[PDB]
Amino acid sequence: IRFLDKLPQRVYSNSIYELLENGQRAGTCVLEYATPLQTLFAMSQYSQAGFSREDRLEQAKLF
Amino acid sequence: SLHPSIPCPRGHGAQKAALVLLSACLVTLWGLGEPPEHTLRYLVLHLASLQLGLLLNGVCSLAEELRHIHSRYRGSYWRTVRACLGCPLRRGALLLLSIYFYYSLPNAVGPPFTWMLALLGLSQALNILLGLKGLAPAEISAVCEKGNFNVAHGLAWSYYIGYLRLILPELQARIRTYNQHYNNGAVSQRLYILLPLDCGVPDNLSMADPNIRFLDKLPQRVYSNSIYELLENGQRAGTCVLEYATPLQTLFAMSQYSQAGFSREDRLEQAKLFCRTLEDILADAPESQNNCRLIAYQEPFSLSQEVLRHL
Ligand SMILES: CCn1nc(C)cc1C(=O)Nc1nc2cc(C(N)=O)cc(OC)c2n1C/C=C/Cn1c(NC(=O)c2cc(C)nn2CC)nc2cc(C(N)=O)cc(OCCCN3CCOCC3)c21
Ligand SMILES: CC1(C)C(=O)N(Cc2c(F)cccc2Cl)c2cc(C(=O)NCc3c(F)cc(F)cc3F)ccc21
């Protein structure tokens, strides 16, 4: 998965990524992560959450 | 040398022609072999008459320039005399030479002193009233350009001082930042200024030629510069920051109105002169460190091909 180009355009920048299959680009797509999962992880890191790793995985699946 | 139609700065052809004429006249005089002292007398008398006529014309000009002294010559008569008759001491010496030569050298073909003065005054009055001593447009343009008395020079310098010098130092950094943001192609780092000799500046650049198409607003008082990519046989081959020359648009608007006294041929002359003046300024300016180029053209053809060949 390698970055190719910032998709042209309230200002959303979606980096597109090409997919190397044995070194050859089988295609490309607009690919991105899910930020609520990152917020769940950061919730689990902090101590003012009461939100453990077991609960973090449970909430990730439920989300 | 931007365009085949842009005039070159005036050469020394007039002085070359004068030297050719002087050589021919010397050949003729040596062939005829007339008494040289008579020739000296005649030439000195002719120059004296011409100088005194110029003195009379300057006096006539001073007669009206005396009323502008408070607002144009800071209320000093010496400034008015200098502006109406050139350098005072040089012309006074020439006039004294004329008077002494005429009063010493007899005039074989010429009036006495009072008769010559009266005839010269009459001729000066006739030339003033009838406009016989008329200024040819070629010499008018030569003098205006030599002394920088053209609207195009002022417009070009205003365009430089107000806009170009402010944005060129940071245009390189802005283009580098944009190219780092949008990668893959890349955008040329040099500004491109359009210069249609016909002064046709459409609001939309793509309307003039579909091959040139807007790409993105370049990131940044507030300078909104639009970048354009050029279509070659349906596919883009290059891209650059391309904007129109607003002073040419102002020149066209000046030509549109009926109070500027600014005709279409005058608009063509000032367009060419603006192109040349901006060429010189951006050639010697420090801010134009190979940073700006002018696409000067005229439709009698595609602009995009010319911009590509520039790229
Ligand atoms: C001066 C150089 N020059 N000589 C000739 C001939 C043509 C130009 C030229 O092209 N100049 C120019 N073009 C710009 C384009 C952009 C952009 N965003 O793309 C940004 C710029 O800088 C802000 C631009 N500048 C410089 C500043 C320009 C205009 N302006 C002036 N008038 C002059 O300076 C002036 C002096 C003489 C003589 N003639 N003129 C103008 C005809 N007073 C201003 C006061 C304010 C304020 N603080 O309130 C804001 C200003 O600018 C906002 C206008 C932006 N409009 C401009 C037109 O198009 C659309 C965007 C002011
Ligand atoms: C170059 C050459 C040979 C020449 O072609 N002329 C024209 C000309 C005349 F004008 C007059 C007669 C014969 C010729 Cl031939 C000329 C004139 C003088 C001269 O002293 N002119 C006095 C003078 C005027 F005559 C009229 C005037 F309004 C003011 C003035 F001061 C000297 C040399 C020449």
Gyration radius of chain A over CA positions: 17
Element (H, E) at B295: strand B292-297
Q: Are B93 and B101 in contact (CB under 8 A)?
A: no
Q: d(Cα A5, Cα B180) in Å, to the nearest integer?
A: 11
* Cα B173-B240-B226 angle, rounded to 5 deg: 80
Produce one character per residue of B132-142: b if its CB has 16 or more CB atoms within 10 Å, e if not.
Answer: eeeeeeeeebe
Q: d(Cα B111, Cα B53) in Å, to the nearest integer?
A: 15
**Amino acid, res. B151:** V
Chain centroid to Cα B285, Å, comes to: 19
Q: Are B281 and B165 in contact (CB under 8 A)?
A: no
Short-list B215, B217, B208, CA closest to B306: B208
Task: For residue B250, report the distance from its CA to the centre of ligand 1, in Å.
Answer: 12
Q: Backbone phi, then psi, for B263, in 5-degree steps?
A: -80, 180
Residue A43, CA distances (Å) to A54, A58, A61 in order: 12, 13, 15
Short-list B76, B282, B303, B147, CA closest to B212: B303
* Ligand located closest to B120 CA: 2
Produce one character per residue of B234-270: b if its CB has 16 or more CB atoms within 10 Å, e if not.
Answer: eeeebbbbbbbbebbbbbbebbeeeeeebeeebbbbb
Element (H, E) at B61: helix B36-65
* Ligand located closest to B98 CA: 2
CB pairs under 8 A between A and B: 9
Short-list B241, B266, B273, CA closest to B252: B266
Short-list B309, B179, B292, CA closest to B245: B292
**Amino acid, res. B226:** S
For ligand 2, say whether the CB of B125 is within 6 Å of any of its atoms. Answer: no
Contact with chain A for residue B184, Cβ under 8 A? yes
**Amino acid, res. B237:** A
Task: Kindly tell me the burial class for residue B62, based on how many C-beta atoms sit within 10 Å of its own C-beta (0-12, 13-18, 19 or more).
Answer: middle
- Data resolution in angstroms: 3.6
Token readout for B110 is 């010429």
User: Between B246-256 and B151-159, two packed helices, what is the crossing angle to 10 degrees?
Assistant: 140
Mutate which of B183, B187, B227 to test chain A, going by most A C-beta atoms within 10 A?
B183
Q: Are A39 and A51 in contact (CB under 8 A)?
A: no
Q: Look at residue A7 and give its three-state secondary structure.
A: coil
Q: d(Cα B172, Cα B165) in Å, to the nearest integer?
A: 13
Short-list B225, B219, B196, CA closest to B299: B196
Q: Are B227 and B187 in contact (CB under 8 A)?
A: yes
Task: For residue B301, report the distance from its CA to the centre of ligand 2, in Å.
Answer: 59
Task: For residue B238, report the distance from its CA to the centre of ligand 1, in Å.
Answer: 29
Q: Are B98 and B47 in contact (CB under 8 A)?
A: yes
